[PDB]
UniProtKB/Swiss-Prot annotation, chains A, B:
Locations listed in the record: Periplasm
Active site annotation, chain numbering: 102
EC top class, as a word: hydrolase
Pfam families: Alk_phosphatase (PF00245)
GO CC terms of this entry: outer membrane-bounded periplasmic space; periplasmic space
Disulfide cysteine pairs (residue numbers): 168-178, 286-336
E.C. code: 3.1.3.1
Reactions mediated catalytically: a phosphate monoester + H2O = an alcohol + phosphate
Protein name: Alkaline phosphatase
Protein residues bound to Zn(2+) 2: 51, 369-370
Cofactor: how bound: Binds 1 Mg(2+) ion. Binds 2 Zn(2+) ions.
Family of this protein: Belongs to the alkaline phosphatase family.
UniProt keyword annotation of DNA damage present: no
Length: 449, 449
C-alpha cells in the first residue's frame, strides 16, 4: 500500500571519525523515492519560505544547532530536492537582473510572471496579474498568509497586493510613491488597504504600526486601517492567548493577527560580525532573546493554528508560511540572529510535515526567495569584511563571514538554491527549475484554474 | 519499456518578460522521474568532479555563457539532484572542521572514511584505507583517472595515493614532508611513485614536471619517474595527436598522458577581479586562451578517449574525470578563468551523458568537492573585496565578488552543494547526504566487494 514517506533520519549514523560512520543513508533509496512519487491532486498546499535561506544559510544553522553530521527534522526531511533560479528583470530593458529582491522574487512564485525588483503583483509593464492566493479564493479553497515580518513586507504582501513599489505600505507612502495606485488617485490602494480587500481567511504576523493610518479616499476614508478592519468584519488578535481562543476563521469571521508593531521578535541574540572578529574577539554562543515572549506566538505556533483553522474548510486550502528574519539578520551580519531564525523555521516545517504526513493530500514545499551573503570559512581566515567565530554544537568553532558590501547591509546574492517538497506533485521541484515554475506547479497540484 | 531519460531541455521556454514564459518545465514531472529510478547494477561509473563548483559557480557560468534562462546541456541535464555536506575533521581532536580542502574531501568520496585536511587516503590515525579505484581494479574492472590539474594534485592523487600530506608530490617533497612514507625510510612512496604502482588502465592530466625526479631507493632508484614509467610498461603520450593513436589501454599497455608541466592551460583569458572593479573599471568580455592549443586535448577530448578505451573491458569500468582549474581560478579571483573551466566541464559531462545514455547501465555523477568563494552580486555593489563586471550572454552585466580573504587566495567555503546523477542507483544522491555516502553508493552500484 502506497504511503509517502518523510526522510526520518539523515543524521550521521555513527562515529564520524570511523569508516562510514559519517554516512547519512542506511541502505538503497530507490524504493523510498519510488514511493514518494504521485501525480494525484493536492488537496492543500503549505509553502514555507525562509527569506534569504540559501544552502549556505541552511548548512551554517545546522552546524551550529545540530552539529555537522546533524539533521533538521523539518528543513532536511523533505525527500524530493532540486535547485531553482530566481533572476529578475531590469524594468527598462526586459533583460535578466541576476540578483533579485524579495518583492520581484515573491511575485514570480505567486503569479508565474517575472518582474522588476521592487514590484509586487505587476509585471514590467506594471500590469496586475493574479496571485495564487487570489486564485485559491476564487476557487473556494481556504487561504492563509503567515509571516514573522510586517504583513506589508514583500513576501507576505506579494500574495494580496499589486503595487508598483514595495514601499507603498499604506495611505501616505503610497500617495507619494505609488500615485497610480493611490485610492484618491482612483487606484486600488496601498498594500495594507489591498490586504484588507483581499480577505484571506487567516492572516498572521507583525506590522500593526501601519494599520494605524487613515484612508484618504473610499468608503472608510477618514478612519484608520485598524478600524476599517474590524468594521469590515475582521476579527483581530494581538497576543497568543487570544490567537488560541479563535475557533473560526472564514470569509465572515476572517482572522487578522498583528503581533508586533514592526517585525515580530528574533529568537536569539548575539553580537554583530566585525572586521577580523574571528581573530580579535573570542568565540560567541547564542543567547535566547528574553523579549521574544510568552505572549508572542512562535512561528510554529502560528502555523499550527492556521493549519487547524484552515483544515475545517472541506474543499482544501492554501497556506504560505514565512520565516522572515533570516534575511533581515543576515544582511545585518548577525550570525546568531540569522541562525536562530532558521531553527525557528525548522519548527514550522515540522508542524507542517506532521499534518501533511497524516492528511495525505498535502504538498509541502520549503525554499527561499533568493540566496544571501553569509559564507562558512576556515577559523584562521583573514577577511575583507565582517566575520565572527561561533561555538557550534560539536564544541568546535565555526567562522561566518559577510563581505559583499561595505555599506550598512550585507547584499543578497544570486546563486540557485535548494527547493524541496513532499506530497502529490513534489516531483516537479526535482532538478533545475525556475521560481515561476513554482506557481504553475502549485496551480496544477491544486487543479486551480 | 523502461528507458531512463536525460532532462532534454530545462531552458526558459519563452519570453522571459511574459507570463510563464520563464518556466523551465512544460508539464508534470512525476512520470519522467518515476522512469529514471532503477536499482539494477551499474555496469560502469563516471564521476565528474568540478573542483570548487558549488551552486554559485554553476549559476554564474550559466548566466555568462548561456543566459539566465539558459540551460547547460551537460551540467544541468542530470535528472536526480541532491545536496551533500563535506566537512572535514580536526586531526588533533576528531571534531568536525567545517571547511574542507581538496585532499580530505576527495579522501572521503574515494574511501568512505572522513579525514583531516591535507590528508590523502588515510584517516586521522594515518592508517591507509583502500580507494574505490583500488577496489575496482581488484575486482577486475577497467579504471581511469582524468584531470586538468597535475596528476599529483589532491583530486586525482587521492585515487591512488596514501600519504600523510598532499604536498608529497614526489621523491624529495616526500622525504622531507612525509618521512613515514618516503621510500628510503621504507614507506610506500611519494604521490607520483604510488601512482605508478597503482597502475590504473588510463591516467591523463598535466604534472609532467614531477615525473622528472629520481627514486632514492627501490628497484628503479637512481632513474627518473618518467623512465621507471615506460620501463614499467606504461605507454606515454604527451600531445593530442598521439593520445588518439592509442587504441589500447590495459594492465600491460597502461596509458599515461602527461599533457603539460604543471596544470593544463585554462580555456578563457580575462583580468582579475579587483577592489571596486565593477565601479572603477568597464565590463569585461572573456576571450579564449590562444595558448590552449591544437596539440592539447580538451577535457571533453580526454574523457571521450577514456570511455572509448575503457569500454573495451567487458566487465565494466570506473572513471573519474576532474574539471580542475575552476577552483584554481576562483581563488585566483578570475571570473573568466573560472567560468571557462565550468563550460569546459559541461562538455565533458555531455560526452559522459551521451555514452551513458546509450550503453544503458552507467551511473553518471556530477558534483564538487566543496563550495568556493565567488558570489553573484548587484551591479552597483560597493564591496570590501575584489569584484568585476562581466557582459553576459543576455547582453546585461553581472557582477562577481570574492570577499572572504585579504590574503592572496580566496578561500574555499563550506555550504552543502549540488550533487546530481543519472542511471542505475542515481536515487541515492537525491536529498541530503554526506560525501562519504558517494563512496558507498558507488561501491554498491558497482557491486564492489
Ligand atoms: Mg520576507
Ligand atoms: Mg582538484
Ligand atoms: Zn528576500
Ligand atoms: Zn534581504
Ligand atoms: Zn578543491
Ligand atoms: Zn581550492
Amino acid at each position: 500500500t502506497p504511503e509517502m514517506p518523510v526522510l526520518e533520519n539523515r543524521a550521521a549514523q555513527g562515529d564520524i571519525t570511523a569508516p562510514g560512520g559519517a554516512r547519512r543513508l542506511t541502505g538503497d533509496q530507490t524504493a523510498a523515492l519510488r514511493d514518494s512519487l504521485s501525480d494525484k491532486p493536492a488537496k492543500n498546499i503549505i509553502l514555507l519560505i525562509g527569506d534569504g535561506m540559501g544552502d549556505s544559510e541552511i548548512t551554517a544553522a545546522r552546524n551550529y544547532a545540530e552539529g555537522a553530521g546533524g539533521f533538521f527534522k523539518g528543513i532536511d526531511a523533505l525527500p524530493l530536492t532540486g535547485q531553482y533560479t530566481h533572476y529578475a528583470l531590469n524594468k527598462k530593458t526586459g533583460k535578466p537582473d541576476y540578483v533579485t529582491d524579495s518583492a520581484a522574487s515573491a511575485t514570480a512564485w505567486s503569479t508565474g510572471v517575472k518582474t522588476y525588483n521592487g514590484a509586487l503583483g505587476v509585471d514590467i509593464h506594471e500590469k496586475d496579474h493574479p496571485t495564487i492566493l487570489e486564485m485559491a479564493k476564487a476557487a473556494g479553497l481556504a487561504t492563509g498568509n503567515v509571516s514573522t515580518a510586517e504583513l506589508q513586507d514583500a513576501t507576505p504582501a506579494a500574495l494580496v497586493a499589486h503595487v508598483t513599489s514595495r514601499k507603498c505600505y499604506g495611505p501616505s507612502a503610497t500617495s507619494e510613491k505609488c500615485p497610480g495606485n493611490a485610492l484618491e488617485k482612483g487606484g486600488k490602494g496601498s498594500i495594507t488597504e489591498q490586504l484588507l480587500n483581499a480577505r484571506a481567511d487567516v492572516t498572521l504576523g507583525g506590522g500593526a504600526k501601519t494599520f494605524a493610518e487613515t484612508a484618504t479616499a473610499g468608503e472608510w476614508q477618514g478612519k484608520t486601517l485598524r478600524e476599517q478592519a474590524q468594521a469590515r468584519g475582521y476579527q483581530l488578535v494581538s497576543d497568543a492567548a487570544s490567537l488560541n481562543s479563535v475557533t473560526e476563521a472564514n470569509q465572515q469571521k476572517p482572522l487578522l493577527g498583528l503581533f508586533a508593531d514592526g517585525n515580530m521578535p528574533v529568537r536569539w541574540l548575539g553580537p554583530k560580525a566585525t572586521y577580523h572578529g574571528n581573530i580579535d574577539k573570542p568565540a560567541v554562543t547564542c543567547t535566547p532573546n528574553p523579549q521574544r515572549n510568552d505572549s508572542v506566538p512562535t512561528l510554529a505556533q502560528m502555523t499550527d493554528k492556521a493549519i487547524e483553522l484552515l483544515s475545517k474548510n472541506e474543499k482544501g486550502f492554501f497556506l504560505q508560511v514565512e520565516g522572515a528574519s533570516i534575511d533581515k539578520q543576515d544582511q545585518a551580519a548577525n550570525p546568531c540572529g540569522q541562525i536562530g531564525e532558521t531553527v525557528d523555521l525548522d519548527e514550522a516545517v515540522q508542524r507542517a510535515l506532521e499534518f501533511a504526513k497524516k492528511e495525505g493530500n498535502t504538498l509541502v514545499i520549503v525554499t527561499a526567495d533568493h540566496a544571501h551573503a553569509s559564507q562558512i570559512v576556515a577559523p584562521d581566515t583573514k577577511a575583507p569584511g565582517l566575520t565572527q567565530a561561533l561555538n557550534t554544537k560539536d564544541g568546535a568553532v565555526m567562522v561566518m563571514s559577510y563581505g559583499n558590501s561595505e555599506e550598512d547591509s550585507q547584499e543578497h546574492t544570486g546563486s540557485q538554491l535548494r527547493i524541496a517538497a513532499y506530497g502529490p506533485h513534489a516531483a516537479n521541484v526535482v532538478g533545475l527549475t525556475d521560481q515561476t515554475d513554482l506557481f504553475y506547479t502549485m496551480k496544477a497540484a491544486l487543479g486551480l484554474k
